[PDB]
Amino acid sequence: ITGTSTVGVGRGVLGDQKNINTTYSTYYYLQDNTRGDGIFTYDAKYRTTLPGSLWADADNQFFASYDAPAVDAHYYAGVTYDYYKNVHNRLSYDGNNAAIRSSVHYSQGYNNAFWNGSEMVYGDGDGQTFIPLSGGIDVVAHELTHAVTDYTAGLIYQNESGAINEAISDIFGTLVEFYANKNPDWEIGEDVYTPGISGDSLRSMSDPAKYGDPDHYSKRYTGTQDNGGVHINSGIINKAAYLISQGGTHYGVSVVGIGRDKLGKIFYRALTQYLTPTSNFSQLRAAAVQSATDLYGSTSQEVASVKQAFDAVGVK
């Protein structure tokens, strides 16, 4: 829409109040003109037709319970755009300030959220397994990272390349959660998963085996479900990334942590300059080693820790 940029106020899924960038033209729309070519949030109104209607509001105040998911989708897309811009000098997901679009209220009782190739889509959850998925900033940044991967490495969504593609989304979703300093942790989806249980999450990067995912290459899943295990075998890489950042001894292999910032720099370089659509784990290892080499020198502690981490999860 063409109109005047302004700021409205609302409440997110978890009840927290926040300011959001809106556009005024008769109605107030969830359209942020301050980032790139814009961040636009739509109402899919419980249907599956996309993108639905650009979200319109009569008074710029978004405190209705129906508004919540749209507030967070809108807001966390802006924090993720800021992260990529400030930290990695990337403008939007294609590197040229593409507009970011998200639809909320997709379908009925839909327990998922996804980047479909053109925009973000979020279910509201059934209320038991999940609450509206846009309340989790690691979930929003995980899905928006698939858009970055699709424009850069192009990892296909199956077997080891799809596991890499999932792990990269978990790592950067976690790094964005730390960047916003929203109660950060190494878990995925804990703010929106099972409202009735405290302490759990969908997956864990610090201990993937807690929920039964592999934390070692010898335990990878080799069947056909989940497109060859793309959400399952991503634990192996998740654990490698957690070790590089935080350090630890895993199956007897000791890794000195180098921290989150270096972890984000090595993986972002690996992703944007060396990974290809069909990279597999062993080529991710070589890409991360080469990236850390480029940045810190082949005899740095940073190269050393990237090797140890991959040796500790059995990736040669």
61 lies in the site for Ca ion, by CB under 5 A:
yes
Q: Where are the alpha helices (DSSP H) in 155-251?
A: 159-179, 225-229, 234-246
Segment 143-172, which members bind a copy of itself (CB under 8 A)?
Answer: 150-151, 154, 156-157
From 107-115, 131-139, 177-185, 261-269, give the range in contact with a copy of itself by CB under 8 A. Answer: 107-115
Q: Check if 143 is active-site.
A: yes
**154 vs 248, which CB is nearer to a copy of itself?**
154
Q: By C-alpha distance, which of 136, 140, 157, 159 is closest to 16?
A: 136
Binding residue (CB under 5 A) for Ca ion from 194, 278, 283, 293: 194
195 lies in the site for a copy of itself, by CB under 8 A:
no
Q: By C-alpha distance, which of 101, 181, 105 is closest to 137?
A: 181
Is 185 labelled a binding residue?
Answer: yes
Q: By C-alpha distance, which of 234, 76, 113, 102 is closest to 164?
A: 234
Distance separating alpha carbons of residues 116 and 27, to the nearest angstrom: 28
Collapse the DSSP code of 179 into the 3-class scheme (helix H, G, I; strand E, B; otherwise coil) and give the result: helix
- The catalytically annotated residue of 74, 105, 119, 143 is 143
Q: Is 314 left (phi over 0), alpha (psi -120 to 50) or beta?
A: left
The sign of the dihedral angle between the CA atoms of 231, 282, 207, 142 is negative
187 lies in the site for Ca ion, by CB under 5 A:
yes
Q: Check if 119 is active-site.
A: no
Binding residue (CB under 8 A) for a copy of itself from 277, 282, 301, 316: 277
Is 138 labelled a binding residue?
Answer: yes
Residues contributing to the site for a copy of itself (CB under 8 A): 46-51, 107-110, 116-118, 121, 150-151, 154, 156-157, 225, 277-278
Instruction: Give residues in contact with Zn ion (CB under 5 A).
Output: 166, 169
